[PDB]
Amino acid sequence: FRTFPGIPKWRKTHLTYRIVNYTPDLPKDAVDSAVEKALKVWEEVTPLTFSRLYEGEADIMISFAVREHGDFYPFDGPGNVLAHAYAPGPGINGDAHFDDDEQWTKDTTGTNLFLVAAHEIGHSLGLFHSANTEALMYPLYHSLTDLTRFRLSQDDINGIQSLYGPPP
Protein backbone atom coordinates (compact mmCIF):
# COMPACT_ATOMS: atom_id res chain seq x y z
CA PHE A 1 0.00 0.00 0.00
CA ARG A 2 0.93 3.69 -0.34
CA THR A 3 -0.03 7.12 1.01
CA PHE A 4 0.16 10.67 -0.51
CA PRO A 5 3.37 12.61 0.48
CA GLY A 6 3.36 14.45 3.77
CA ILE A 7 0.75 11.72 4.56
CA PRO A 8 -2.35 14.02 4.41
CA LYS A 9 -4.96 12.45 6.60
CA TRP A 10 -8.18 13.59 8.19
CA ARG A 11 -7.59 14.83 11.76
CA LYS A 12 -11.01 13.77 13.03
CA THR A 13 -12.86 10.49 13.04
CA HIS A 14 -16.32 11.52 12.03
CA LEU A 15 -16.60 12.66 8.37
CA THR A 16 -19.49 14.10 6.44
CA TYR A 17 -20.53 13.35 2.94
CA ARG A 18 -22.88 14.85 0.47
CA ILE A 19 -24.20 13.69 -2.91
CA VAL A 20 -24.35 16.96 -4.86
CA ASN A 21 -26.00 15.74 -8.08
CA TYR A 22 -27.27 12.57 -9.75
CA THR A 23 -26.39 10.73 -12.94
CA PRO A 24 -29.11 10.09 -15.55
CA ASP A 25 -27.72 6.49 -15.83
CA LEU A 26 -29.37 5.07 -12.66
CA PRO A 27 -32.17 5.57 -10.21
CA LYS A 28 -31.27 7.95 -7.35
CA ASP A 29 -31.67 5.07 -4.82
CA ALA A 30 -28.97 3.09 -6.58
CA VAL A 31 -26.53 6.02 -6.53
CA ASP A 32 -27.19 6.36 -2.76
CA SER A 33 -26.85 2.63 -2.00
CA ALA A 34 -23.63 2.51 -3.96
CA VAL A 35 -21.94 5.45 -2.07
CA GLU A 36 -23.17 4.00 1.24
CA LYS A 37 -21.72 0.60 0.52
CA ALA A 38 -18.49 2.27 -0.70
CA LEU A 39 -18.22 4.18 2.58
CA LYS A 40 -18.95 1.02 4.71
CA VAL A 41 -16.02 -0.80 3.09
CA TRP A 42 -13.65 1.52 4.92
CA GLU A 43 -15.86 2.21 7.99
CA GLU A 44 -15.79 -1.52 8.69
CA VAL A 45 -12.00 -1.63 9.28
CA THR A 46 -11.29 1.66 11.08
CA PRO A 47 -12.64 4.00 13.74
CA LEU A 48 -14.04 6.29 11.03
CA THR A 49 -17.75 7.05 10.99
CA PHE A 50 -19.74 8.92 8.35
CA SER A 51 -22.91 10.94 8.12
CA ARG A 52 -24.75 12.42 5.22
CA LEU A 53 -25.52 16.06 4.67
CA TYR A 54 -28.07 17.65 2.32
CA GLU A 55 -27.04 21.37 2.40
CA GLY A 56 -23.76 23.07 3.14
CA GLU A 57 -20.13 21.95 2.76
CA ALA A 58 -19.47 18.33 3.73
CA ASP A 59 -15.94 16.98 3.95
CA ILE A 60 -16.41 14.59 1.00
CA MET A 61 -18.63 16.27 -1.69
CA ILE A 62 -19.64 13.67 -4.36
CA SER A 63 -20.68 14.72 -7.87
CA PHE A 64 -21.11 13.57 -11.43
CA ALA A 65 -19.28 15.65 -14.02
CA VAL A 66 -18.30 15.72 -17.77
CA ARG A 67 -15.30 17.26 -19.50
CA GLU A 68 -14.45 20.63 -17.85
CA HIS A 69 -16.24 20.88 -14.56
CA GLY A 70 -14.64 23.67 -12.61
CA ASP A 71 -11.39 22.22 -11.39
CA PHE A 72 -8.13 22.10 -13.31
CA TYR A 73 -8.62 18.42 -14.30
CA PRO A 74 -11.17 17.96 -17.08
CA PHE A 75 -12.62 14.48 -17.69
CA ASP A 76 -11.80 12.75 -21.03
CA GLY A 77 -15.14 11.47 -22.49
CA PRO A 78 -15.89 7.72 -22.54
CA GLY A 79 -13.68 5.13 -20.81
CA ASN A 80 -10.10 5.72 -19.59
CA VAL A 81 -10.38 8.06 -16.56
CA LEU A 82 -13.54 7.03 -14.74
CA ALA A 83 -13.53 9.29 -11.69
CA HIS A 84 -11.01 11.30 -9.66
CA ALA A 85 -10.69 12.30 -6.03
CA TYR A 86 -8.59 14.61 -3.91
CA ALA A 87 -6.59 13.69 -0.80
CA PRO A 88 -7.83 14.71 2.79
CA GLY A 89 -7.95 18.42 3.59
CA PRO A 90 -10.23 21.51 3.33
CA GLY A 91 -12.41 22.71 0.41
CA ILE A 92 -12.05 20.59 -2.75
CA ASN A 93 -9.70 18.24 -0.89
CA GLY A 94 -11.44 14.98 0.02
CA ASP A 95 -14.00 15.43 -2.77
CA ALA A 96 -14.73 12.89 -5.52
CA HIS A 97 -15.93 13.48 -9.08
CA PHE A 98 -17.30 10.77 -11.43
CA ASP A 99 -17.13 10.98 -15.18
CA ASP A 100 -20.70 10.86 -16.52
CA ASP A 101 -19.42 9.90 -19.97
CA GLU A 102 -19.21 6.43 -18.42
CA GLN A 103 -22.40 4.31 -18.15
CA TRP A 104 -22.69 3.83 -14.38
CA THR A 105 -24.32 0.53 -13.32
CA LYS A 106 -25.19 -1.47 -10.23
CA ASP A 107 -23.89 -4.64 -11.84
CA THR A 108 -21.00 -5.35 -14.17
CA THR A 109 -22.81 -4.47 -17.46
CA GLY A 110 -21.28 -0.90 -17.56
CA THR A 111 -18.87 0.86 -15.10
CA ASN A 112 -19.80 -0.39 -11.63
CA LEU A 113 -20.54 2.63 -9.44
CA PHE A 114 -19.78 0.92 -6.11
CA LEU A 115 -16.38 -0.36 -7.11
CA VAL A 116 -15.11 2.99 -8.46
CA ALA A 117 -16.69 4.78 -5.44
CA ALA A 118 -14.93 2.59 -3.01
CA HIS A 119 -11.60 3.05 -4.83
CA GLU A 120 -12.16 6.87 -5.00
CA ILE A 121 -13.08 7.11 -1.29
CA GLY A 122 -9.77 5.30 -0.69
CA HIS A 123 -8.14 8.37 -2.20
CA SER A 124 -10.42 10.83 -0.27
CA LEU A 125 -9.20 9.11 3.00
CA GLY A 126 -5.49 9.41 2.12
CA LEU A 127 -4.54 6.20 0.27
CA PHE A 128 -2.56 6.47 -2.94
CA HIS A 129 -2.17 3.56 -5.47
CA SER A 130 -1.07 0.08 -4.39
CA ALA A 131 1.69 -1.96 -6.04
CA ASN A 132 -0.37 -5.09 -5.04
CA THR A 133 -2.48 -6.39 -7.94
CA GLU A 134 -5.44 -7.67 -5.91
CA ALA A 135 -5.82 -4.54 -3.79
CA LEU A 136 -8.82 -2.24 -4.43
CA MET A 137 -6.26 0.62 -4.54
CA TYR A 138 -4.32 -1.01 -7.42
CA PRO A 139 -4.93 1.37 -10.36
CA LEU A 140 -6.41 -1.43 -12.55
CA TYR A 141 -8.78 -2.68 -9.82
CA HIS A 142 -11.60 -1.87 -12.31
CA SER A 143 -10.67 -4.63 -14.76
CA LEU A 144 -9.43 -7.20 -12.15
CA THR A 145 -12.17 -7.25 -9.47
CA ASP A 146 -14.92 -9.93 -9.17
CA LEU A 147 -18.10 -8.45 -7.71
CA THR A 148 -20.17 -11.17 -6.07
CA ARG A 149 -17.26 -12.05 -3.80
CA PHE A 150 -15.80 -8.56 -3.18
CA ARG A 151 -13.41 -8.44 -0.18
CA LEU A 152 -11.09 -5.55 0.76
CA SER A 153 -7.60 -7.07 0.52
CA GLN A 154 -5.29 -7.19 3.48
CA ASP A 155 -3.07 -4.61 1.65
CA ASP A 156 -5.94 -2.07 1.72
CA ILE A 157 -6.71 -2.80 5.41
CA ASN A 158 -2.99 -2.54 6.28
CA GLY A 159 -3.02 0.78 4.41
CA ILE A 160 -6.08 2.44 5.91
CA GLN A 161 -5.17 1.21 9.44
CA SER A 162 -1.70 2.62 9.21
CA LEU A 163 -3.56 5.92 8.87
CA TYR A 164 -6.49 5.61 11.25
CA GLY A 165 -5.74 2.41 13.18
CA PRO A 166 -8.06 -0.59 13.63
CA PRO A 167 -11.62 -0.24 14.73
CA PRO A 168 -12.42 0.17 18.50
In this structure, the chain runs to a length of 168
The residue range among 30-38, 97-105, 123-131, 133-141 that interacts with Zn ion, by the rule CB under 5 A, is 97-105
Asked if 18 interacts with Zn ion (CB under 5 A), we say: no
Vertex 8, ends 6 and 12: CA angle to 5°? 140
d(Cα 44, Cα 75) in Å, to the nearest integer? 31
Question: Tell me, what DSSP letter sits at residue 127?
Answer: B
Applying CB under 5 A, does 88 fall inside the site for Ca ion? no
The closest residue (CB) to Zn ion is 97
Q: How far is the CB of 75 from Zn ion (least distance, A)?
A: 7
Instruction: Confirm or deny that 93 is annotated as ligand binding.
Output: yes
Looking only at the bridges linking them, the beta strands covering 96-99 and 60-65 are parallel
155 counts as binding Ca ion under rule CB under 5 A = no
Of the candidates 88, 94, 122, 126, which one interacts with Ca ion according to CB under 5 A?
94
- Does residue 126 belong to the site contacting Ca ion (CB under 5 A)? no
Q: Quick one: 107 or 154, whose CB is closer to Ca ion?
A: 107
Local structure of 60: helix, strand or coil:
strand
